[PDB]
Design brief:
The complex is a heterotrimer, with 2 copies of chain A (about 100 residues) and 1 copy of chain B (about 10 residues).
Chain A lengths: L1 E2 L6 E6 L2 E7 L7 E3 L8 E7 L2 E15 L2 E10 L5 E2 L1 H4 L5 E3 L1
Parallel strand pairs in A: 3-8, 4-7
Antiparallel strand pairs in A: 2-3, 2-6, 5-6, 6-7
Chain B lengths: L6 E2 L2
Classes of the chains: A mainly beta (about 100), B mainly beta (about 10).
Subunit structure (chains A, C): Homodimer, whose active site consists of two apposed aspartic acid residues.
Protein name (chains A, C): Protease
């Protein structure tokens, strides 16, 4: 689809068998979701944002469906103010910026 | 309010 | 043009008689630039994201050219770790997300 930016680019994704809402974020290297349980082992990691750094749990090789498109990759879980789909998964679904 | 979700790894 | 997301989507912008590299960020409501001494009146503001909030100065109706595309709007200036072009200006240049 083609998404304009007059509003936040939110979409529905399915992860761990559950549905959630997330923002397509070209300004994020990674995909970060708010606290939630996910199967598998996780390693502690730190990421930076506009206001500083936070600690997150890193889960690898996780299947994520974004608007019907399949992706399998790294998902970070932690105290982010919003669920964001970063470039690591945006590239998998073939997303590009156009103008 | 939270409105700028820049993000990056160390 | 069409910008792929294998790498951070950085582009050159012209603001206040200067050329700078800025990140096209669909995950940002506003445009935030690294500290710079711009003339004109401004208003104090707090913006947030991952990690917390930072204090910035808000300037209105500032002309900004992005990759040859002219735009004009609000620009926030403060201790951001990167120059960020948000949706307020992305809509003005007809930028869309496509997949």
């Amino acid at each position: 689809p083609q998404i304009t930016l007059w509003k936040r680019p939110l979409v529905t994704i399915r992860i761990g068998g559950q549905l959630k809402e997330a923002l397509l974020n070209t300004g994020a290297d990674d995909t970060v979701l708010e606290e939630m349980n996910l199967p598998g082992k996780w390693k502690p990691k730190m990421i930076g944002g506009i206001g500083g750094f936070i600690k997150v749990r890193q889960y690898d090789q996780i299947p994520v469906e974004i608007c019907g498109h399949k992706a399998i990759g790294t998902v970070l879980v932690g105290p982010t103010p919003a669920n964001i789909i970063g470039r690591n998964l945006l590239t998998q679904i073939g997303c590009t910026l156009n103008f | 309010r939270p409105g700028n979700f820049l993000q990056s790894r160390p």
